């Protein structure tokens, strides 16, 4: 008769027109979902809400599963609700999906046994919708699974009895697993929202997902929020300015939830005729401020309130009934008070439960429970469950304990916490950090950036400085401004760190990290800085070099691998080399520092007081043209001993240039990395000359070249020289065969300095190895790995090599492949 899908769209539009779908909105004002402030969405590249499920750029491969990850408060629910409304309004997926089914994971039970009847309860009031009709057909239906991490109770990601078929009733965990794994109603689309931490389990269900990260408000979007929140423009501007002046809070406000909390606080202060001051610095300070302002205008119910929250965390319960409120001393009068002020919500769409306005608030109270003046009240058992899904990870519960357990405390509710307990907890928290600071990642989590968000929450230097004494090595990945703010605070107070590794994720290409590099330059203990494999391009190097010229820098080793640097950055690197007398090791591998960049770099390398000892220029798009400048550096440098230039186009002519100066007996070169440089036997006479004259050269790496047997003979003329002191010779993958074995054998029985000789991916043959075995027994000085890896031989040869290892144990390592 009529198309029932129209009624469903009408239902969705009337239901999702508001932000919460719940009452107690500070007098239940209309929240107006049209206020939605745009969130930043990055595909793992910026994307639009439309075309989200389109096939990718090759093979036209379709996507069924899309996962949206983000922090608590970033807007995963407001965004998923927005999609429901936009679709129902005909502004999104108009010709892609016939239905959108919104699944609220805080309502789904992992214990209760049910068929796929959620499709009934999640839609119109009609108790008997046409489930068996065309709505049963996949490819036109998208499910929105909102809050994977909010599922209450243990969840097993590995299930034997997957139980497909929507008609069969089964446990919620099994049912969700089959839906996520696309075994139940396959070829349907599924969108999942989750906190990044819960991906530890979800990753096993998804198989081949598309991932999108949700980022909060840009500075422009923060302003829009305030202007939309406050209908009075004069107030909106005053509020914005007050916050803008608070750099720390402004930074935190990238999270929509933080903006909401702050705005609500200011609104209440306006109504009461207060100063409107907002001086919060930490997440805890913001939450305490908010709750205090609401409780001030009652406060004797804090115990029951906190106890309720704590129970919910331990028993995995978010939704409460009147019985649960009464069981904790909450009954009607105070409950209503907590609806007038926005602490609880009841739900308005023909439902009656109670819950906290946000999971972070429930966790806040659950944390405060431990400090007041009944699951445990033992912080030890709490911490033991930190990394577990089963308890909701307790990330904010612990993070808030750090903030609450602080000597720098004030009045209003906070004063009701016990000082004796606070000290007991404080000490346990220090022990917890010491233990977690020394651990393997293993996807478990108090991840160093996380221990730093914990430390940031308490500004007490006496605590933080001691906590930071457990981090001799810091490895972190920063994606947002808040990550930098937190990292800088902790590093500024760390006097033990010797090695620091900083990753940068899509927000370098800019100066975002300037406020962190300015910290590193004042560190006295830091000696090694690793900034590899991140987009620290030219402008980023300029900032770093500015800080490396600081008189107290003390950085000795700097690793700059795939940083996206070009020749211009060498100008600034040179300036550092000409001033900073402490820098010893510099790795510039895998950059675009072509011949010109080296010419510039060499200006610093040839400078008096440049003490650089080790330089890596591997895969830097170099060719023979630059060898003239490198040769000049080798000729005069008093400190450069290690030079690695492989994986470049330094052909025979380039090597001959370097050799012309390297052969000088006064040259300090000790290790030469002429690896995958396209050398042939033509240049071996040059290398031979160097070996014969330069007694300081101890390591030569020629693997990947094509020297052949002729090259070996030429090198042997030098290697067999009485004044040659080479200790390590690597000739892997040099296109050598059995015809060179006579000369290699001669080397083994004549060289006095050789200790390690490495042959590898080449057709040495069985005759070759057997001949070596027969001479390696005759008081050979060779002690180290003989190589012969990635080589295959007959049974006799394998036995002979094993025999040699037992008979002549001085040659400890042969390293056969089998």
Ligand X SMILES: CN1CCC[C@@H](Nc2ccc(-c3ccc(C(F)(F)F)cc3O)nn2)C1
- Residues at the site binding ligand ATP, with contacts judged by CB under 6 A: 19, 35-37, 39, 72-78, 146-147, 150, 193, 225, 256-257, 260, 358-359
Selection from ligand ATP, ligand X, none that 75 binds (CB < 5 to 8 A by kind) is ligand ATP
> Quick one: DSSP state of residue 185?
S
Pick from 298, 459, 306, 450: nearest CA to 372? 306
Q: Which residue is nearest to ligand ATP (CB)?
A: 75
Per CB under 6 A, which region of 65-73, 272-280, 573-581, 686-694 contacts ligand X? Answer: 65-73
Q: Is 75 annotated to bind ligand?
A: yes
* Nearest to ligand ATP of 136, 340 (CB atom): 340
DSSP-assigned letters across all residues of 695-725? TT--EEE-TT---HHHHHHHHHHHHTSTT--
In the complex, least distance from residue 278 CB atom to ligand ATP, rounded to whole angstroms? 17
Distance CA(132)–CA(57), nearest Å, equals 36
**The entry of ligand ATP, ligand X, none that residue 258 binds, CB within 5 to 8 Å by partner kind:** ligand X
CA-to-CA distance for 460 and 58, rounded, in angstroms? Answer: 54
Pick one of 142, 359, 449, 617: the residue that binds ligand X (CB under 6 A): 449
Judged by CB under 6 A, which of 37, 251, 360, 534 binds ligand X?
360
In the chain, the N- to C-terminal Cα span, in Å, equals 75
Q: Strands 189-194 and 141-146: what pairing? A: parallel
Cβ closest to ligand X, residue 149 vs residue 173: 149
- Site residues for ligand X, 71-110, by CB under 6 A, read 71-73
Least distance to ligand X, CB of residue 365, Å: 13
Q: List the single partner that 77 binds among ligand X, ligand ATP, none, CB under 5 to 8 Å by kind.
A: ligand ATP
- Residue 74 annotated as part of some ligand binding site: yes
Residues 462-481 that bind ligand X (CB under 6 A): none
Yes or no: say if 497 and 475 are a contact pair by the CB < 8 Å rule: no
**CB 445 to ligand X: min, Å:** 6
**Which positions from 191 through 220 interact with ligand X, judged by CB under 6 A?**
197
Nearer to ligand ATP, 146 or 492 (CB): 146
Residues 66/148, Cβ–Cβ less than 8 Å = no
Task: For the CB of residue 72, give the shortest distance to ligand ATP in the complex, in Å.
Answer: 5
Give 488 or 758: the residue with its C-beta nearer to ligand X. Answer: 488
Q: Which is nearer to ligand X, 197 or 788 (CB)?
A: 197
Between 283 and 362, CB nearer to ligand X: 283
Give yes or no for a contact between 184 and 176, defined as CB atoms under 8 angstroms apart: no
Is position 78 annotated in a ligand binding site? yes
Considering CB under 6 A, how many residues would be counted as binding ligand X? Answer: 15
Identify which of residues 468 and 715 has a Cβ nearer to ligand X in the complex: 468
Q: Which is nearer to ligand ATP, 356 or 471 (CB)?
A: 356
What is the separation of C-alpha 767 from the centre of its chain, rounded to a whole number of angstroms?
A: 52
Choose among ligand X, ligand ATP, none what residue 256 binds, the Cβ cut-off being 5 to 8 Å by kind.
ligand ATP
- Those residues whose C-beta lies under 8 Å from the C-beta of residue 332, and which sit 6 or more positions away, are none
Residue 197: contacted member of ligand X, ligand ATP, none (CB under 5 to 8 Å, by partner type): ligand X
**437 labeled part of a ligand binding site:** no
- Alpha helices (H) in 20-127, listed in sequence order: 76-88, 118-121
CB of 85 to ligand X, least distance (A): 24
What would the two tokens of residue 557 be?
């080793």
**Burial level of 233, CB count in 10 A (0-12/13-18/19+)?**
exposed
3 state SS of 301: helix
Residue 193 contacts which entry, ligand ATP, ligand X, none (Cβ below 5-8 A, type-dependent) = ligand ATP
- Please, which residue, 144 or 455, has the CB nearer to ligand ATP? 144
Instruction: Choose between 78 and 313: whose C-beta lies nearer to ligand ATP.
Output: 78
- Window contacting ligand X (CB under 6 A); options: 110-118, 157-165, 252-260, 636-644: 252-260
Tell the smallest beta-carbon distance from residue 73 to ligand X (Å): 4
- Integer-rounded Cα Rg, in Å, for the chain is 34
CB under 8 Å, gap of 24 or more: what pairs does 177-186 form?
Answer: 177/205, 179/143, 179/145, 180/65, 180/145, 180/205, 180/206, 181/205, 181/207, 182/64, 182/65, 182/207, 184/116, 185/116, 185/136, 185/138, 185/141, 186/138
Closer to ligand ATP by CB, 36 or 470: give it: 36
Closest C-alpha to 485, from 786, 787, 672, 283:
283
For residue 567, give the DSSP letter.
T
295 binding partner (options ligand X, ligand ATP, none; Cβ < 5 to 8 Å by kind): none
Question: Cα(226)–Cα(241) distance, rounded to whole angstroms?
Answer: 10
Report what 449 binds from ligand X, ligand ATP, none; CB cut-off 5-8 Å by kind.
ligand X
Judged by beta carbon distances under 5 to 8 A according to partner kind, the member of ligand ATP, ligand X, none in contact with residue 146 is: ligand ATP
Our measurement of the distance from residue 610's CA atom to the centroid of its chain's CA atoms, rounded to an integer in Å, reads 36
Residue of 205, 255, 451, 467 interacting with ligand X (CB under 6 A): 255
Q: In the numeric block, which tokens belong to residue 623?
A: 């060719």
Return the range that interacts with ligand X (CB under 6 A); candidates 124-132, 229-237, 447-455, 685-693: 447-455
C-alpha 146: how far from its chain's center? 23
3-state secondary structure of 26: coil
Q: Kindly tell me which of 216 and 597 has the beta carbon lying closer to ligand ATP.
A: 216
Residue list 694-753, contact with ligand X (CB under 6 A): none
Closest CA to 283 of 436, 482, 429, 449: 482
Do the strands 113-114 and 170-171 form a parallel or antiparallel pair, or are they unpaired? antiparallel
The residues, any chain, with a CB within 8 Å of residue 733's CB and separated by 6 or more, are: 703, 704, 705, 760, 761, 762
| 3-state secondary structure at position 484 | helix
Which residue reads 């745009």 in tokens? 38
395 is an interface residue for ligand X by CB under 6 A:
yes
Q: How far is the CB of 215 from ligand ATP (least distance, A)?
A: 11
Q: Of these partners, ligand ATP, ligand X, none, which one is at the site of residue 283 (CB under 5 to 8 Å by kind)?
A: ligand X
Is 42 labelled a binding residue? no
* 39, interface contact from ligand X, ligand ATP, none, CB < 5-8 Å by kind: ligand ATP
**In this structure, how many other beta carbons lie within 10 angstroms of the beta carbon of residue 675?**
22
- CB nearer ligand X, residue 97 or residue 226: 226
Note the residue count of the chain.
818
Q: What is the number of alpha carbons within 13 Å of residue 688 lying toward its C-beta?
A: 17
SS3 621: coil
To ligand ATP, the closest distance from the beta carbon of 532 in angstroms equals: 34
Closest contact distance (angstroms) between CB of 39 and ligand ATP is: 5
Q: Which residues contact 58 (CB under 8 A, 6 or more apart)?
A: none
Residue 70 marked ligand-binding: yes
Question: Phi/psi class of residue 790: alpha, beta or left (left: φ > 0; alpha: ψ in -120 to 50)?
Answer: left
> Which one of the spans 251-259, 588-596, 694-702, 733-741 is the region binding ligand X (CB under 6 A)?
251-259
Tokens describing residue 187: 């070829």
3-state secondary structure of 254: coil
**What is the number of the residue whose Cβ is closest to ligand X?**
71
Q: Is 174 annotated as a binding residue?
A: no
Q: Which is nearest to 267 in space by CA: 293, 288, 286?
A: 293
Residue 258 beta carbon to ligand ATP: minimum distance, rounded to whole angstroms? 9
- With b meaning 16 or more CB within 10 Å and e meaning fewer, what string describes 62-97? eebbbbbbbbbbbbbbbbbbbbbbbbbeeebbeebb
Binding partner selected for residue 450 from ligand ATP, ligand X, none, CB under the kind-specific 5 to 8 Å limit? ligand X
Q: Which of residues 273-292 bind ligand X (CB under 6 A)?
A: 283, 286
Report whether 37 belongs to an annotated binding site: yes
> For residue 734, what are its two tokens?
């040099």
- Binding site: residue ranges? 37, 70-78, 358
- Binding site for ATP: residue ranges? 37, 70-78, 358
> Which residues make up the interface to ligand X (CB under 6 A)?
71-73, 197, 255, 257-258, 283, 286, 360, 395, 447, 449-450, 453
């Amino acid at each position: 008769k009529k198309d029932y899908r129209k009624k469903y769209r009408k239902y969705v539009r009337s239901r999702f027109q508001c932000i919460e779908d719940r009452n107690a909105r500070l007098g239940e004002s209309v929240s107006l979902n049209k206020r939605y402030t745009r969130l930043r969405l990055i595909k793992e590249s910026p994307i639009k809400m439309e075309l989200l499920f389109d096939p990718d750029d090759e093979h036209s491969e379709p996507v069924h599963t899309v996962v949206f990850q983000g922090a608590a408060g970033i807007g995963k629910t407001i965004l998923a609700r927005k999609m429901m409304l936009d679709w129902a309004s005909g502004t999104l997926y108009q010709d892609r999906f016939d239905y959108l089914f919104y699944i609220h994971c805080r309502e789904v039970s992992l214990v209760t046994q049910r068929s796929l009847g959620d499709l009934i309860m999640s839609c119109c009031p009609d108790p008997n919708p046409p489930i068996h009709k065309i709505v049963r057909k996949p490819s036109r239906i998208l499910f929105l699974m909102d809050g994977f991490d909010e599922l209450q109770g243990a969840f097993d990601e590995h299930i034997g009895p997957l139980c497909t078929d929507w008609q069969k009733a089964e446990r919620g965990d099994i049912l969700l697993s089959s839906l996520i794994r696309k075994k139940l109603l396959p070829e349907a689309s599924l969108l999942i929202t989750t906190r990044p931490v819960a991906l530890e389990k979800l990753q096993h269900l998804l198989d081949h997902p598309r991932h999108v990260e949700i980022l909060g408000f840009s500075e422009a979007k923060r302003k829009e929020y305030f202007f939309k929140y406050f209908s009075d423009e004069a107030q909106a501007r005053a509020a914005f300015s007050l916050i803008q002046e608070n750099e720390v809070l402004f930074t935190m406000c990238f999270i929509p939830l933080v903006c909401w909390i702050v705005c609500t606080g200011l609104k209440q202060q306006m109504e009461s005729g207060k100063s409107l001051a907002q001086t919060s610095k930490t997440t805890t300070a913001v939450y305490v401020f908010f709750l205090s302002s609401l409780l001030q205008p009652l406060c004797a119910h804090l115990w029951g309130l906190c106890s309720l929250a704590a129970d919910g965390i331990w028993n995995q319960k978010i939704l409460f009934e009147e019985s649960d409120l009464r069981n904790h001393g909450l009954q009607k009068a105070d409950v209503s008070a907590f609806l007038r002020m926005n602490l609880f919500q009841k739900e308005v769409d023909c439902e009656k439960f109670y819950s906290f306005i946000h999971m972070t608030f429930q966790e806040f109270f659950a944390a405060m429970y431990y400090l007041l003046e009944l699951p445990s009240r033992d912080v030890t058992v709490l911490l033991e469950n930190y990394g577990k899904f089963e308890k909701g990870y307790l990330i904010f519960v612990v993070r808030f304990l750090f903030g609450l357990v602080n000597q720098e405390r004030t009045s209003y509710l906070e004063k009701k916490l016990s000082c004796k307990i606070s000290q007991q907890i404080r000490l346990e928290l220090l022990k917890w950090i010491e233990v977690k600071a020394k651990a393997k990642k293993l996807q478990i989590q108090p991840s160093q950036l996380e221990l730093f968000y914990c430390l940031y929450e308490m500004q007490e230097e006496d605590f933080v400085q001691r906590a930071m004494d457990y981090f001799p090595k810091i490895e972190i990945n920063l994606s947002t401004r808040m990550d930098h703010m937190v990292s800088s605070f902790c590093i500024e107070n760390c006097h033990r760190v010797e090695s620091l590794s900083l990753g940068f994720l899509h927000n370098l290409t800019s100066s975002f990290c300037r406020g962190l590099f300015s910290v590193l330059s004042t560190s006295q203990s830091l000696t090694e800085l690793d900034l590899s494999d991140n987009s620290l391009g030219d402008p980023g190097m300029r900032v770093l070099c500015e800080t490396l010229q600081h008189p107290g820098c003390n950085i000795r080793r700097l690793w700059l691998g795939r940083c996206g640097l070009s020749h211009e950055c060498c100008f600034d690197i040179s300036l550092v080399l000409s001033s900073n007398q402490k820098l010893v090791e510099l790795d510039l591998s895998d950059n675009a520092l072509g011949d010109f960049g080296i010419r510039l770099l060499c200006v610093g390398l040839k400078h008096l007081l440049c003490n650089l000892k080790k330089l890596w220029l591997v895969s830097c798009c170099l060719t023979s043209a630059c060898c003239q400048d490198l040769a000049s550096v080798l000729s005069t440098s008093h400190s450069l001993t290690r030079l690695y230039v492989g994986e470049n186009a330094l052909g025979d002519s380039g090597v001959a240039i370097l050799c012309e100066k390297a052969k000088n007996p006064q040259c300090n070169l000790q290790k030469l990395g002429l690896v995958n440089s396209g050398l042939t036997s033509v240049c071996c006479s040059a290398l031979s000359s160097v070996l014969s004259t330069n007694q300081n050269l101890t390591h030569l790496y020629l693997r990947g070249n094509t020297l052949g047997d002729k090259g070996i003979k030429l090198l042997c003329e030098g290697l067999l020289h009485p004044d040659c002191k080479l200790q390590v010779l690597e000739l892997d993958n040099c296109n050598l065969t059995s015809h060179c074995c006579w000369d290699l054998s001669t080397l083994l029985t004549s060289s006095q300095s050789l200790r390690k000789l490495s042959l590898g991916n080449n057709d040495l043959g069985d005759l070759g190895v057997m001949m070596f075995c027969e001479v390696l027994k005759q008081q050979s000085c060779l002690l180290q790995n003989l190589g012969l890896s990635e080589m295959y031989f007959n049974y006799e040869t394998k036995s002979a090599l094993e025999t040699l290892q037992e008979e002549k144990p001085e040659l400890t390592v042969v390293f056969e492949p089998s």
